[PDB]
Design a protein around this ligand. Structure first.
Ligand SMILES: Nc1ncnc2c1ncn2[C@@H]1O[C@H](COP(=O)(O)OP(=O)(O)OP(=O)(O)O)[C@@H](O)[C@H]1O
Lengths: 227, 119, 130, 124, 119, 124, 118
């Protein structure tokens, strides 16, 4: 009974298996390329860390909106999701963590704003009609700095203008090929910046205030790119 | 005998809702077997989340089976089981682990077993 | 002294040269081969390098310069060597940023349109100066 | 000639699932997939048009030696028809040699003849 | 009788193209059901979108079927059929709604039904 | 009123089966899905509750002319109950005309009665 | 018959280890095809290097195949087979070329062919 049914079912399952195998191989190759890009990026972040810590540390730190804690009335959240499904809990973990953090910290929509990277996050947030500010979708599978420079700079400018007082960012961290874990990081202000390898003697050729003015947005943009 | 005027309106409605959820869960099985939970819509996630618990709560520990497992077993009334299933359907126990619903009766035993497990 | 340029997309390298000539808001700026360490931001300009006999000139944008008696670095958002002028695309970029200035709140706003024009003109012109 | 044809057709059959992406190595997802599509076009045939065995060998030789790698896939079926009539005008010594000795001609002679035809062929 | 020398080369080409597009559509029906429409390539999305139009356009309103359809019924010549199918294959009517191609007759009726639907 | 209902319902079943495989849905598909869900909700019926054809035609007309497009899918049963109760008092001449002539009444009266019932109808 | 009650504990251990190494090499095929021989850990490279030697040493030149190759062929005793496979497993001949392990019957012919090659 249902012999034709079973045969058709078997054929469909075989074709599905082949398609999924091909997708797995493609994913492996693209993961290797992504690791290569991260390895390329690392030294720039290292040097930026060194310069930022050396300049900020000491009596010359003084005060700056991106450097010192403003009074907190609002909070910005930057969430990074994918554009294509079939990735497992990669989006669910981030979205659930962000939802629970928002529900614990705030009660009114005016207390927070959301910046979403990814097509998945848009639908999740607008299903509940949560606040949304700006978005970018359909990035290349191997993004470059030019693809997100504008959005990172716009977010930094929004922080500078006082649109919101503190900025948080959530993303999945690639600990290993089997496990990926979500993390929360604080971008602005640059609180709890640890010490450098050694205190510097860099003479502030322009005013160190102008040094900070130039340096801080680039630091935030680099952090966004690394995440 | 499963008629509204023979068992009562509340009993009839509870039974129909349970059967509907179980039917939907049975429909989802083929997709679950391949893509897992990760591709289901938000509503179907809740449907599975509740169907698992309802299915487990349908089990019971018999008096006769005491010679097989050593558990004393229990006897539950119709009103008690209807109230328990209505509470489960309303979503009052979505925070409990599914293993707490297994092989017990009277729903208070579900709560006690979850507490013993450490919830 | 050794000169290196680092870009987030990838390092762009150069060997040891005698002197480095750079422009900055500080004004007339020029490093020493054994200079005391300091920091100095850079605008959209070109960094002039001079090895013994042969000289090289590299474009830069969003530069942050650090110096040390051993190493000299340019934390560059974008840096292109002398042979990598890409004059024709930069020529289009000059036009590409030209209308954006004259366009009120264009698709890419003035916060890049202002910077694009000064970027495009340098990429068009300041290179190939060897 | 036919020995290599079995390999390419099998590999294209083996790697059919990857035809959608085209996002991997040239060999893995471009070289084999492009060659396999060419082979399927050549093996097509019409009604009641038997081909002499001498003409079959040459057209399979052209594919297996990489002389069809520049022609678009949609243009392969037209390339075959014009190649046969070209042989009747300039490859008579080529066709005769296969008939008389049942062996492949000198590769140098046939390489020029195949290459010469590609010059007069206009891409669709 | 489906031969080039009996029906015409253009007729044969249109028939073969329709058959191969429908065959290609039939193969995707299995993987689509559990991998979604998005995971297909751009060209395969196009062939699916056009094959739906072909399949829905292959239907017709019969004079006899007036009882079951409520419509008078239509009669269409071979020239109109082949020209319309060639246009649908070439994509001149990709914008029209999917539901507008069924039980119509000519492509003039297709576009009139789409217009009456508000497109 | 309902010549096309069976065909529309079969098409809606096929469309629900297909479009379940994707969230990016078109406006027309959304409208068809809403109409199909509402029709399926309408067709439900309890046990030993016969309904005269003069009321079946009215409810199916109200469904197919778009007067049910805004009621939530969970309220259609109560909507139908209230509609029958309201027809038992107002619009009795509509039922008389349908029962006598076996034809639809003037379409203006249908619209007026349906709107009058909808104004007093309240969403749960 | 592949049980310690028949062939012996040494034979059984050698056979089991050979099969395990071959299965590991079979598993690594996908990653080898994707990322190439590189991008491999130490154990991956070592197991591939030993498994290729084992797989080639499984080959043998038959007396019948003389009509095809001209080689006389050999009758390899089970004792010699087990000893040679154990020695290859231990890694003694890790430096010999791959093709030296092909179609040469007993173990000493492997080193003889390697010496003839260089
Ligand atoms: N003509 C060019 N000259 C130099 N670098 C270029 C050129 N075109 C692209 N690039 C490089 O491409 C990357 C992205 O360019 P960038 O973000 O600086 O903006 P842009 O090229 O001015 O943009 P637009 O596309 O608006 O012209 C940088 O690494 C930059 O060096």
């Amino acid at each position: 009974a249902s012999l034709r049914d079973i045969k058709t079912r078997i054929n469909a399952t075989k074709k599905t298996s082949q398609i999924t195998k091909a997708m797995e191989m493609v994913s492996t190759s693209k993961l290797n390329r992504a690791e290569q890009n991260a390895k390329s990026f690392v030294p720039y972040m290292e040097k930026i860390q060194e310069v930022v810590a050396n300049v900020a540390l000491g009596a010359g730190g003084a005060s700056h909106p991106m450097l010192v804690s403003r009074p907190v009335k609002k909070t910005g959240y930057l969430v990074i999701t994918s554009d294509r499904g079939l990735a497992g809990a990669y989006n669910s973990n981030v979205l659930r963590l962000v939802y629970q953090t928002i529900q614990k910290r705030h009660a009114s929509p005016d207390e927070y704003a959301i910046i979403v990277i990814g097509r998945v996050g848009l639908s999740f947030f607008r299903k509940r009609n949560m606040p949304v500010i700006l978005d970018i979708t359909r990035l290349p599978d191997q993004p470059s700095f030019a693809d997100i420079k504008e959005i990172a700079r716009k977010t930094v400018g929004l922080f500078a203008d006082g649109t919101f007082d503190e900025l948080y960012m959530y993303y999945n961290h690639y600990v290993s090929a089997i496990q990926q874990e979500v993390t929360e990081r604080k971008l602005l202000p640059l609180t709890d910046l640890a010490e450098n390898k050694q205190r510097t003697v860099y003479e502030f050729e322009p005013s160190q205030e102008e040094i900070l003015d130039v340096l801080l947005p680039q630091y935030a943009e680099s952090l966004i790119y690394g995440a | 005998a499963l008629a509204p005027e023979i068992v009562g309106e509340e009993h009839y409605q509870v039974a129909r809702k349970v059967q509907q959820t179980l039917q939907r869960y049975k429909e989802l099985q083929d997709i679950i077997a391949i893509l897992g939970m990760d591709e289901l819509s938000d509503e179907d996630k809740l449907v599975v989340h509740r169907a698992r618990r309802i299915q487990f709560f349908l089990s019971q520990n018999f008096h006769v089976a005491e010679q097989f497992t050593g558990q004393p077993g229990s006897y539950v009334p119709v009103k008690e089981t209807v109230r328990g299933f209505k509470e489960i359907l309303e979503g009052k126990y979505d925070h409990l682990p599914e293993d707490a619903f297994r092989l017990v009766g009277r729903i208070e035993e579900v709560v006690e077993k979850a507490k013993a497990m450490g919830v | 002294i050794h000169v290196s340029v680092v870009t987030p997309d990838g390092p762009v390298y150069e060997d040891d040269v005698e002197m480095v000539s750079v422009k900055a808001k500080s004004g007339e700026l020029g490093i020493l081969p054994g200079h005391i360490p300091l920091v100095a931001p850079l605008e959209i300009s070109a960094a002039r390098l001079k090895k013994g006999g042969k000289t090289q000139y590299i474009a830069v944008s969003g530069g942050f310069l650090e110096v040390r008696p051993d190493k000299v670095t340019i934390l560059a958002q974008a840096a292109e060597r002398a042979e990598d002028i890409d004059v024709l695309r930069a020529k289009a970029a000059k036009e590409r940023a030209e209308r954006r200035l004259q366009s009120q709140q264009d698709d890419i706003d003035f916060k890049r349109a202002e910077l694009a024009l000064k970027r495009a003109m340098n990429r068009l012109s300041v290179a190939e100066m060897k | 000639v036919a020995g290599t044809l079995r390999l390419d057709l099998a590999a294209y059959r083996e790697l059919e699932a990857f035809a959608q992406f085209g996002s991997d190595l040239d060999k893995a997802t471009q070289a084999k997939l492009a060659r396999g599509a060419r082979t399927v076009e050549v093996l097509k045939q019409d009604l009641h048009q038997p081909i002499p065995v001498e003409k079959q060998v040459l057209i399979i030789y052209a594919l297996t030696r990489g002389f069809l790698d520049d022609i678009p896939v949609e243009d392969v079926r037209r390339f075959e028809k014009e190649f046969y009539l070209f042989l009747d005008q300039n490859g008579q010594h080529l066709l005769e040699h296969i008939r008389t000795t049942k062996d492949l001609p000198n590769e140098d002679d046939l390489n020029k003849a195949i290459e010469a035809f590609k010059k007069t062929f206009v891409v669709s």
